[PDB]
Design a protein around this ligand. Structure first.
Ligand SMILES: *[C@@H]1O[C@H](CO)[C@@H](O[C@@H]2O[C@H](CO)[C@@H](O[C@@H]3O[C@H](CO[C@H]4O[C@H](CO)[C@@H](O)[C@H](O)[C@@H]4O)[C@@H](O)[C@H](O[C@H]4O[C@H](CO)[C@@H](O)[C@H](O)[C@@H]4O[C@H]4O[C@H](CO)[C@@H](O)[C@H](O)[C@@H]4O[C@H]4O[C@H](CO)[C@@H](O)[C@H](O)[C@@H]4O)[C@@H]3O)[C@H](O)[C@H]2NC(C)=O)[C@H](O)[C@H]1NC(C)=O
Ligand SMILES: *[C@@H]1O[C@H](CO)[C@@H](O[C@@H]2O[C@H](CO)[C@@H](O[C@@H]3O[C@H](CO[C@H]4O[C@H](CO)[C@@H](O)[C@H](O)[C@@H]4O)[C@@H](O)[C@H](O[C@H]4O[C@H](CO)[C@@H](O)[C@H](O)[C@@H]4O[C@H]4O[C@H](CO)[C@@H](O)[C@H](O)[C@@H]4O[C@H]4O[C@H](CO)[C@@H](O)[C@H](O)[C@@H]4O)[C@@H]3O)[C@H](O)[C@H]2NC(C)=O)[C@H](O)[C@H]1NC(C)=O
Ligand SMILES: *[C@@H]1O[C@H](CO)[C@@H](O[C@@H]2O[C@H](CO)[C@@H](O[C@@H]3O[C@H](CO[C@H]4O[C@H](CO)[C@@H](O)[C@H](O)[C@@H]4O)[C@@H](O)[C@H](O[C@H]4O[C@H](CO)[C@@H](O)[C@H](O)[C@@H]4O[C@H]4O[C@H](CO)[C@@H](O)[C@H](O)[C@@H]4O[C@H]4O[C@H](CO)[C@@H](O)[C@H](O)[C@@H]4O)[C@@H]3O)[C@H](O)[C@H]2NC(C)=O)[C@H](O)[C@H]1NC(C)=O
Ligand SMILES: *[C@@H]1O[C@H](CO)[C@@H](O[C@@H]2O[C@H](CO)[C@@H](O[C@@H]3O[C@H](CO[C@H]4O[C@H](CO)[C@@H](O)[C@H](O)[C@@H]4O)[C@@H](O)[C@H](O[C@H]4O[C@H](CO)[C@@H](O)[C@H](O)[C@@H]4O[C@H]4O[C@H](CO)[C@@H](O)[C@H](O)[C@@H]4O[C@H]4O[C@H](CO)[C@@H](O)[C@H](O)[C@@H]4O)[C@@H]3O)[C@H](O)[C@H]2NC(C)=O)[C@H](O)[C@H]1NC(C)=O
Ligand SMILES: *[C@@H]1O[C@H](CO)[C@@H](O[C@@H]2O[C@H](CO)[C@@H](O)[C@H](O)[C@H]2NC(C)=O)[C@H](O)[C@H]1NC(C)=O
Ligand SMILES: *[C@@H]1O[C@H](CO)[C@@H](O[C@@H]2O[C@H](CO)[C@@H](O)[C@H](O)[C@H]2NC(C)=O)[C@H](O)[C@H]1NC(C)=O
Ligand code: G28
Ligand code: G28
Ligand code: G28
Ligand code: G28
Ligand code: NAG
Ligand code: CA
Ligand code: CA
Ligand code: CA
Ligand code: CA
Ligand code: CA
Lengths: 388, 388, 388, 388
């Protein structure tokens, strides 16, 4: 109809209720489920769907062997109905590639997929299910993007890309697209020293992205974007409640404009909702591996370098595998506020479970409640032994 | 379009004709059919569909082992086209949880799923396929609901929940929702001493629910709701034709305001149509197990403590497994009256058929005819031996 | 929109072109295809689809054992997209039963399914996908109907049923339905002595049904219906080109008002287009079994007792299995005439191929061309050996 | 809405970006994927889909044995969602036959399928999913057509057929259809000596077809059609950059009006975009087999007999199997120009990989970019060893 505008503020997050779970690995043990990774969730005005990077093979198929690898010519961004698994028969291909982002602007959807060899990748921007724009690698080193939904405001949908080293300074750009065409792009500015896989959400005409400093930071970099002025700033979450993984143990004071040191060249895509006292952080429970997952209310996390949790909710037990996590919201829901949501990728197989030769995942996602709901844990649920 | 209003009375029930049967277990022996239980049927203005609680695995899948269990993080309310089986590929997830209800109000559908551990469950009310309201456990003991469709009138859709003991007095509430939001809730009142899994239907602006007294009653409690005044009453079916299972043998006089004694802490979800002489009761044939199923015309069953059958129809032979049963009607059919319908859950596997490690079911459903139709029996039809 | 009216005459049939083929048995050797029989084809104003009586199991499934049997509680009328096979995932159940008919009246579709034991069957008439009317067995001996599409004119859709003996005189009725309700019914009149499984089509406000005299006739009975007056007549195809199976060898003169003798108590559902010189007859090639299939132009077959072929076209070789055949036309096609069409059921398995324990079929269908097209044969194509 | 008119010119082709890839053979190793060959891509105003000639069996099915053969009664033109594989469950049959073409005219789609024995084939033209016209073989020798999409302009959709010898002069005709009816047909004229499988595209009211001279030419014949005048001309691509396969090595001067000699009676369906300096040619890398695939910018290839490449892009490595290739464009995209696209059939199995008994393929397709994008190779990706 008309372009959606971020006119509402976030609803108060007093807890998280279950939104979707596909039990993909369990079900795929005996049905035609595609092997995937790098999932996310994104809504259209009339429907919300699961998204992910297929590996171009079923889990039980012999080609599942080797799916731990990230970039092949057999990957593609696919979407499928909420809480269903990604099967060969219900998965809709949005585009071909090994890194992506996607978002609806109110009128139609923009999907971006990047493909290519390491030194010659290219992004192709699709809008209304047609290819519209293409961007060639600028640093010749794995051009890559969010791996979660982008956000739009009055037709403008900013997307953060990175090209160059993952263990050194790199060339990050914020592109502002409208109807799949480039209106403008900027180099990253601010104090964030390295950006990877941004998780974004919008409220009251501002887009907040919580990303990953793969190079040095265990605290998360944050990019706040003004989609009207088409400008942005960057910093780190000040809080001592560190949210990357692997990471050092929590200090009593964090860092606002530098990476918090202790762990280099590694990290996991994650997210957060930064809204004054209504601030919640997601992180794996383990400081060593992609294990477990919890949500922590850390009032003023972004700006208070001594902020510590005041409430919390466990999502996945530390005795269960987790993985990537990101944000999305249904901007077309009824009500006066935007209900914060997120998904957690539950990785199974390699590298942690090497008795099988594949790597895949299932998805669990939650949204906020203004109630103070009882909590439960949500594991993948599959028995690797069955696959042997 | 506009909210549906219960303006018609029931059609005269002279017999029952076959409406839907999915042969799920038979078909699932060699195709991707989800393991389910707690099925039901519910109509939208333009389509009627089967519903059930998936177990998050196929019947032939190795994860089918253990599906006798009731509440896991892998369950979800799913719906699929009438008389098809619930397959991995045609099943639509309405919400995540291990207890549910759902109904269309004329404009859109409300679905409710409860999930959580035993002492910390929570219901989340979905409307127009979006989460709208959440209710936290009030008694911290398996918050649970109908397991069959709710009914709406002018936007108001009452739902009966129970929280607390299943073998003692508990905290039952009647919630009145409108567009997924709570307008009001009451504690259970009347003479019903314990309520579990209500089966409901509406006619001439009154909603009748036949439930289950798991604690002491072999006769069924009944909750009649006024969705305009948003008030209700409760009593038991007076008839000596006892309809719970397990149950004592039929007496010559029943009880109107107390459970009929003889069997404690057990029962099966069931239903009835209470309409003066046009009154029909469903019950298993066996007084000992979920075996067989028959419909009995017991004029004035609700109010006459000596009422006995005047007509009958066998649905499932006592030599075949049955299970839960509930009511639904197509409130959007043509005609001057509402045609009473019901479904019977045909449980296969555990606990009665323990040579297999799973528990699932198929569905058979009938609707009334003003004709006096010949009868046939409708078993599940699968051979357990094939699954070994 | 508006009720369709049979305002056109048939197009000139100079040959038959391929219309649809599903290769169901071939494909089903390694995919989830339902076992079926008694197929047909029927069009809606915007789509034409294949129809059949499922057996409630896949071909490779263990429950396929025994599918030679005709009436079980596991059968249902299903429809699916033209030329696709009937799979567990794309098949839409129209109703439950072991005998059926279906037709679109221009506004919506009427489907009829009969179920029950031999002495207590009942038909239930569905309209706009809802149950509307029910008819109880009148002779208590396998109430049964067409097994191919009915035809409508200004809302009136006549259907021929038979109840009683298949090897003696029986009680055949012509029902005239409108919006799923009975307007009127007649007993069979005319000279046809026994009616089974009528194949019908309409043109210029007249409905012609070519049926099967299972009792004594090797020539086919024909019922012509006036859907406005709601009256009919019956006779036999006069032609010596006998079209039932099994059958005696062709004589030089046929019979107009009596069964042509030579074979008792057996026959196959078949059809014909009776239109003066534009008359074509379908029949198996073998006079002994459901083997092969050919179309023969026999000018004035209905009324000329010495009529012999003037042109012909082989559809299936005598070295391939055939089965039932019936008529349908797309009454919503462009043009000034109705293009005659038909389908042939290609039965595989039992009883002729007993190395397998199942019985199923695939479908091939053709429509007429005003061209004189080259011919090809269209077998099922599956290798039974593969199923062993 | 209204008939589409070729009002735009081609966009400048500076490189090719990835458009679609279905990874069919990989995925089909463990899921219900139909065996196919002779694929292509074609767009409707609201969707673009993959097309191909199914073999009426899955790849893993036992009937896959023998699929190297070209014409059987089990083949059919099927279409399915872009980048999905052709599965038994998502494939839509357009018509029955072993040679086809299809195109949307703006209002609805025309599909053509030819079937029959070698000496008695016939084409049947479908429009709006209904059969409309039929054409009988004129030379009684494998009537056949494009195997890729046709193109329409103001309702007129020309199609090139060939009937007669594939290794000698034959009878090629250009038919001009409108709403599935024949407006006119011509015999082939010009200097092209033999025409097989034309690949076409349209721009500024002219339709260009790059075909295959199976008889003598290693350079490609080209048919340019005026769909308004309904007239055409024919010649060969003048360029010494030979694009058929097998073929001699490139000379320094090509031939404009005769086949370039060196290889007889063989060839592969291919294509090209002939647009002055914006001219690109596709060809296999190997001059001996259907191996590898590259795009070469050969300014003025059609008219300059000494034209050599000025830019290039590898699509498939010479160490990977390729096959047929053809053109299509989305005539309903936004923008001021038509973006040239093409697909490459990646054949697997027989005859080159004879350890398996089947022959199938997967599809990769690209479209042009005005950017100078980095290149990657796009192989089928399946391991034949897995199928053994
Ligand atoms: C039914 O459901 C309800 C609803 O969920 C249940 O009630 C919930 O119970 C939760 C668990 O108790 C509770 O969650 C906790 O909240 C704490 C904050 O609340 C308390 O403090 C505030 C502030 O003063 C008070 O207002 C309040 O009254 C409470 O006293 C959090 O602090 C908790 O998180 C911390 O502990 C968990 C382990 O429990 C860690 O995993 C987590 O990371 C937090 O601790 C680490 O991080 C901090 C900050 O740096 C460190 O100080 C600390 O040492 C830990 O650090 C180590 O561990 C981390 C992670 O491994 C590592 O990185 C680091 O290096 C160190 O090794 C927790 O979130 C809910 O708030 C509460 N909800 C409600 C509404 O009440 C109820 O129990 C359920 N009922 C039943 C019967 O079960
Ligand atoms: C073709 O189709 C038609 C249409 O269906 C067939 O006709 C139908 O035939 C049915 C079976 O005969 C018949 O059903 C019965 O109707 C009885 C009522 O009708 C009779 O009584 C009235 C009242 O005076 C008369 O008007 C009427 O003319 C008849 O005489 C029911 O009473 C029957 O139910 C009872 O019996 C069945 C077993 O048959 C039990 O399973 C059932 O539970 C009922 O009996 C138990 O319950 C009562 C009440 O408490 C007890 O008194 C009794 O002892 C039984 O109790 C034991 O068993 C129960 C259950 O196990 C247990 O809980 C308890 O503790 C005790 O152990 C039955 O419903 C249809 O009405 C009739 N329909 C029509 C339209 O005619 C026709 O036969 C078919 N044709 C062919 C050729 O087959
Ligand atoms: C390319 O394609 C074209 C287009 O299809 C091919 O041309 C077609 O060729 C067809 C086969 O030749 C041909 O079909 C036949 O037509 C005959 C009628 O035409 C002839 O007679 C008329 C009338 O005088 C002439 O006008 C005309 O010029 C011809 O001379 C039919 O009579 C044929 O059917 C009979 O034979 C077939 C076997 O071929 C039987 O299966 C069939 O049942 C018919 O014969 C039985 O029935 C009759 C009637 O009672 C009996 O008299 C006779 O003895 C047979 O009876 C026995 O067999 C039956 C069945 O088993 C059994 O019940 C009974 O008891 C007895 O045992 C046949 O239909 C097409 O018309 C023709 N089409 C066109 C447009 O030309 C062309 O060949 C192809 N090209 C190539 C290169 O292959
Ligand atoms: C990142 O991505 C970019 C973007 O893709 C990469 O840059 C691209 O690199 C490509 C490969 O180098 C390049 O493709 C070539 O372009 C040549 C034309 O450019 C050159 O010549 C022009 C003209 O003077 C200059 O303007 C220009 O500056 C260049 O110098 C083509 O000529 C190339 O094709 C020929 O070679 C390939 C093998 O490389 C053959 O397969 C192909 O068939 C061509 O050669 C055959 O055909 C010709 C013509 O008849 C014969 O003369 C020749 O002998 C060969 O003939 C034999 O082989 C054929 C086929 O087997 C056989 O039939 C015959 O009988 C003989 O046996 C090639 O297309 C892109 O243009 C370039 N793109 C851009 C934008 O720059 C970049 O490298 C990537 N980066 C990294 C780090 O990898
Ligand atoms: C088929 O015939 C009936 C007439 O018998 C047509 O019905 C008339 O249609 C118009 C528009 O619907 C009404 O105003 C008339 O009263 C209708 N009916 C009768 C029964 O008189 C019908 O429109 C015809 N069908 C089609 C497709 O033209
Ligand atoms: C393509 O060209 C034809 C004109 O040749 C356009 O047809 C005219 O369209 C309008 C609206 O449909 C009619 O009133 C004219 O009479 C049409 N036709 C002719 C043949 O004169 C057509 O609209 C054009 N297509 C598009 C998408 O614009
Ligand atoms: C931070 C992005 N990088 C470094 C290039 C990664 O390796 C990502 O790591 C992971 C990962 O789980 O750590 C998954 C993604 N598939 C990778 N992205 C790409 C484009 O390969
Ligand atoms: C009466 C409801 N209760 C007691 C909590 C049950 O155990 C139900 O029993 C049965 C049952 O078949 O008896 C099935 C339901 N899955 C159970 N419901 C829940 C929420 O677990
Ligand atoms: C002529 C109809 N009769 C006799 C009842 C049949 O047996 C039919 O035979 C055949 C048949 O292939 O001969 C198939 C049908 N499934 C049967 N119909 C029913 C209702 O069982
Ligand atoms: C050039 C067309 N001809 C000669 C008849 C072919 O054999 C084609 O060859 C090939 C081929 O891959 O060479 C595939 C097509 N399936 C064939 N077409 C038909 C109609 O059989
Ligand atoms: C395939 O067919 C050939 C030829 O009929 C036969 O020899 C061969 O054994 C078959 N192979 C398989 C695997 O069926
Ligand atoms: Ca399988
Ligand atoms: Ca890090
Ligand atoms: Ca009880
Ligand atoms: Ca007979
Ligand atoms: Ca050639």
């Amino acid at each position: 109809r008309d372009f959606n505008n971020l006119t509402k503020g976030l609803c108060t997050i007093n807890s998280w209720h279950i939104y979707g779970k596909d039990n993909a690995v369990r079900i795929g043990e005996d049905s035609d489920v595609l092997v995937t990774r790098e999932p996310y969730v994104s809504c259209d005005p009339d429907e919300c769907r699961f998204y992910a990077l297929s590996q171009g093979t079923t889990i039980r198929g012999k080609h599942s062997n080797g799916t731990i690898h990230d970039r092949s010519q057999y990957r593609a961004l696919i979407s499928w109905p909420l809480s269903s698994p990604p099967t060969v028969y219900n998965s809709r291909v949005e585009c071909i590639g090994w890194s992506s982002t996607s978002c609806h602007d109110g009128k139609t959807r923009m999907s971006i997929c990047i493909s290519g060899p390491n030194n010659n990748a290219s992004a192709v921007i699709w809008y209304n299910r047609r290819p519209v724009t293409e961007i060639n690698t600028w640093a010749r080193n794995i051009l890559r993007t969010q791996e979660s939904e982008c956000v739009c405001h009055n037709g403008v949908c900013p997307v953060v890309f990175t090209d160059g080293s993952a263990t050194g300074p790199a060339e990050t750009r914020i592109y502002y697209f409208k109807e799949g065409k480039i209106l403008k792009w900027e180099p990253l500015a601010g104090t964030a020293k390295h950006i990877e896989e941004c998780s974004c959400y919008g409220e009251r005409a501002e887009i907040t992205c919580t990303c990953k400093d793969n190079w040095q930071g265990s605290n998360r970099p944050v990019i706040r974007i003004d989609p009207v002025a088409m400008t942005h700033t960057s910093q780190y979450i000040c809080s001592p409640v560190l949210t990357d993984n692997p990471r050092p143990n929590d200090p009593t004071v964090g860092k606002c404009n530098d990476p918090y040191p202790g762990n280099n060249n590694n990290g996991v895509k994650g997210f957060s909702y930064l809204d004054g006292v209504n601030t919640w952080l997601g992180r794996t429970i383990s400081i060593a591996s992609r294990s477990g997952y919890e949500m922590l209310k850390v009032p003023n996390a972004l700006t208070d370098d001594k902020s510590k949790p005041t409430q919390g909710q466990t999502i996945v037990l530390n005795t269960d595998w987790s993985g990537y996590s990101g944000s999305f919201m249904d901007y077309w829901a009824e009500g006066e506020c935007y209900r914060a949501c997120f998904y957690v990728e539950l990785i199974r197989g390699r590298p942690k479970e090497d008795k099988v030769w594949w790597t895949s995942n299932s998805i669990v996602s939650m949204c906020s409640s203004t109630e103070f709901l009882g909590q439960w844990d949500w594991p993948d649920g599959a028995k690797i032994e069955y696959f042997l």
